[PDB]
Amino acid sequence: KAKSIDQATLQLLDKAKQDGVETVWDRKADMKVQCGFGSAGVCCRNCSMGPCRVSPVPGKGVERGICGATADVIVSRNFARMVAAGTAAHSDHGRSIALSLYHTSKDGDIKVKDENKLKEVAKSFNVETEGRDIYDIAHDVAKEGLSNYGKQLGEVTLPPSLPEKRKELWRKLGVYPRAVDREIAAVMHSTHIGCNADAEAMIKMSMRCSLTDGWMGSFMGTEFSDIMFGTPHSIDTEANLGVLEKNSVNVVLHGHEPLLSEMVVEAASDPELVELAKSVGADGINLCGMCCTGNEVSMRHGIKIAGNFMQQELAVVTGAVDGLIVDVQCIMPALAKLSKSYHTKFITTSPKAHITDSIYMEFDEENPLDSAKKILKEAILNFKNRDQSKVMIPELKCKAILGYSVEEIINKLDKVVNTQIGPMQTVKPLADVLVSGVLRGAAAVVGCNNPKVVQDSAHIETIKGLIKNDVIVVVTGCAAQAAAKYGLLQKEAAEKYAGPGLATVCKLVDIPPVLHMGSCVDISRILDLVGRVANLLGVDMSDLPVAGVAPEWMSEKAVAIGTYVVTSGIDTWLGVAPPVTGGPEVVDILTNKMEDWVGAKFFIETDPHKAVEQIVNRMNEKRKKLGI
Amino acid sequence: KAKSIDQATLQLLDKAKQDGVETVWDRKADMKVQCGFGSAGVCCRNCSMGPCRVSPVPGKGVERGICGATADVIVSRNFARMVAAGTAAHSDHGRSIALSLYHTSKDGDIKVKDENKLKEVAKSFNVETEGRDIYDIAHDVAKEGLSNYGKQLGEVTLPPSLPEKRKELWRKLGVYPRAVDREIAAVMHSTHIGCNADAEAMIKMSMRCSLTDGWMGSFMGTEFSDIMFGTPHSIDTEANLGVLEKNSVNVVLHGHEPLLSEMVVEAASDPELVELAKSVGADGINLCGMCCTGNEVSMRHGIKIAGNFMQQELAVVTGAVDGLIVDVQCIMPALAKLSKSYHTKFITTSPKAHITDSIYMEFDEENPLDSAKKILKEAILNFKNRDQSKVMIPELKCKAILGYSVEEIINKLDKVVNTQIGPMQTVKPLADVLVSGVLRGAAAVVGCNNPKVVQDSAHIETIKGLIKNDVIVVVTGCAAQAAAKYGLLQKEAAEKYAGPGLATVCKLVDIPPVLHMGSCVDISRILDLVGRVANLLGVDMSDLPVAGVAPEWMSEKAVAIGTYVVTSGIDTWLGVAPPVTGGPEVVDILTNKMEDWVGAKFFIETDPHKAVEQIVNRMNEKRKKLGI
């Protein structure tokens, strides 16, 4: 089968074959037929009595592990641990952001750039703002956010966009969230040998844990990032590997933590570093981003996006990356080995993400700007080691428009508001187009790449099908970057791919049919948007014609995201089967019984066209339930 | 191979074969040859690009996972997740204890029974005590303990017995602990795909996480349990399955959390329940404990111990267990199936541990005594369903002495203190016998059973070898219960098994050669003891001739325990190989490089006699280093 639908990706794969280096596709081929027990989730290693593998087919073979655990128990515990790991990644990101907020000052490297957003957040956290210094408010807000992570007494703080009905449903179900780290610890405790051996209770614990990601960790990370670095607005950028410059220093920012990439962007305008780039024979400094850190700097500053997850290696294969600076998460360790075949300096910066044989330059949060400057200086000085005979940058780049935060979307919707009617600054125009049926619904396309799927194929096919069916699409993460590379993040795309209702809406509001809402933590924005719509219509989020899709997901973070999206009341389609087919009870809970609990459920569909059809049918069913 | 060295265990295995019921041994046999990849730790399932298996033999076969992770990376992440799971189990136990402390009242079900212990703990937590109400002090202490779990700013609180040198070494190494749930979340975050791919850093993160178990979670759980339920003192009890009564109601308490078992013990003396037991035709109520909850109620009240981990099923096989009340952890789910073959009521009580097809009676912490009375009444009423023709109780039980908390040990040591010299109430006599060489050292024997080892064989052989070599032995958990069943927890055992120096010490102090220090969380007591000795000698804990042994461990909790014991500076022998042989770098870190970091290291030895020899040699070389 084809490795990708992206032509630049294919050219660089040919180059990597010529250079004798191996990619993620080569390692996937080397893995051959993957273990059936692990693929079905019926393998357990939770204690040293094991490893235990039970039959994925009930009634045949070994039925129980040594402790007596059934296939359903093993599957449910494995699924819960995936959710806990994803929640941990997102919560650690949000915790770093909250600590950065706590360390803001007027004359420091980290300031408050959006005071209005900070005051609204302070209102949401019961922090007084009138007649107060802005940094005192910021510190109080950071304290409340940090308490959300580890409070042992009392209730956590949740955003006002979350409907009261959803909160009450969670409380009745027993999944109402506690402090984030406490829920992660609870999930890890209940999967220990000889604890929870009941699939339904295990799934409910995992949902409870995922809620602390969706509504607390990711939400606080996003809102505090907006406070410190600015709320995203409509902004132009370029996407795909063609953004690399042969005649300039190329600095590629990979990872998820935004403070480092923000400081690197600021350092790139330093006169001394620009002069140094000129002195090593380069035209200038060309910052490019990848994955979620690329999404953040692109949403807030228009930094060009070099590529998504499965392109990271190919970025090095060009031979033009002088410095690859990585913080945490979704950083293929093979990059270190790959960097030996080129001049590239592979720089790790976080104590959480040491990588063997990489150059470690710890990013100092006490002096973020100076630390970013020294890291960037190492990248710039590496330009002298460039071998221009090994350089091949495909001439394939695509224009994209992004920056669609909830605030930006509301500002855009204000155009189609009659002044004599109003109100202004609400999601009411979006609610109106959804209720009238001009738009059939809204769908979030999120997730990673996965060698099991032709890279970016499922993302593009799902998005095109949805917008052709007058479903407005919001995108995050690597799916958003696939849309950017393909050319869907363009106003012209409305008349090229969208159906009649969505084309009319795009023309009236002057937006692309596909709205890039940011990184994987920025999925919280999607929740926020949906919540607002629900609160405007006086219904729960499970009554709306909305859906989420993860066509090509790979990470534990994706599992946690899908779990909290379903738990919030939004049906989720998974384009890659999770390792649960071995447990019939777990499959039945996730795809059938979940609808009785939270009004939504998982859909597993590896065919994107069938997924689009199912999404449209489900949205029409919910519309008929709602009367619209 | 023999299944056990215990004769009562063998008789009940014959009965289980005659009854056509499966045991843990039968399921272990059914599992046959366990997966080599999982056994070596070279299998990874951390993302849905996998499952990935790399060769346990370097230089052959597949070398890297799909993301590029090496065998060392996969092994180190798997080990770190085991540590995180064990830390989560212990920390959740301690968190429940702290919450119970927070709800103590003068006229409530949960009171303060050891005010002196509470005042000393309050001193350790910087809580004022002079001229204050005892329950105000208790609530402040509980608040400080709870803050240890989830504080995001500042430093955690550690017991005064921990040497300053050990803390400084931890700070220099980068493993100084943070809040417990924060460290669990950090480990889970760094094992996520594309985060940490460096074995040394991964092992250091796991050590940092395990410290929050050893010195914060388990320590606080133990000390708060002492405050609420009484400090253990020397007390007599009986051990092994013979403690069951044919003519009495048999109520078996299995699990770890002590509040439920304490309330059940209190409810058993209720006049209405005793009258009900008489009216259902029984002579009375016979409470028996298993595993750690049995250890707690036995340490504090002399409740008879029915058996350790791999005996739990056999307790039901007798046909005499009218009620089996379980809370969390090390509860084989197969019990639910097994109790169908008998009249036994298998009662789950904790929302953390639901077991399918068991009778769920949620233990209400708000009204603990009434809830315990209701559960106990269900067990008593089940006596009418006893089938006395199916009853077979082995006439095999053994006298044991336990209750050796640090306070009790100090009280015993006061006997050999010359009044004209002093001081009293210190560990000084123990330090003196260790320094003089009358005792060669002290060894902690802890851990579970494991079907991979003849049950209780390794525990007994290791303990007998150590005490024969004049090494005083402290025991916890299932190892302590194996010693109890065998008969080592007896004063007579001193003249039957101990060497000359240990026999003299036992005669002078009037103690058994093997000291039962309580449950698995009570391993913190061992730490406390060692710390005191170190603080009395002005040395670090790694300079002492001390060791820990886990001859037959199975649980993730055991992994976390061994990790924090080694990190504290105490060499640890493992009688069951952990899944790390696939990663040569991880093996080298755990067994060789750890000594450079923390002055102690792991020893993997499956032969108990060889383990005793190695322990004696290591203790002698540490003595020669210390000059004693």
Ligand code: SF4
């Ligand atoms: S999933 Fe289990 S059975 Fe399959 S290779 Fe991995 S450890 Fe072995």
Ligand code: SF4
């Ligand atoms: S927890 Fe149970 S099923 Fe899992 S490895 Fe241990 S004995 Fe086997």
Ligand code: SF4
């Ligand atoms: S994290 Fe890497 S090694 Fe582990 S399953 Fe995913 S791709 Fe394979």
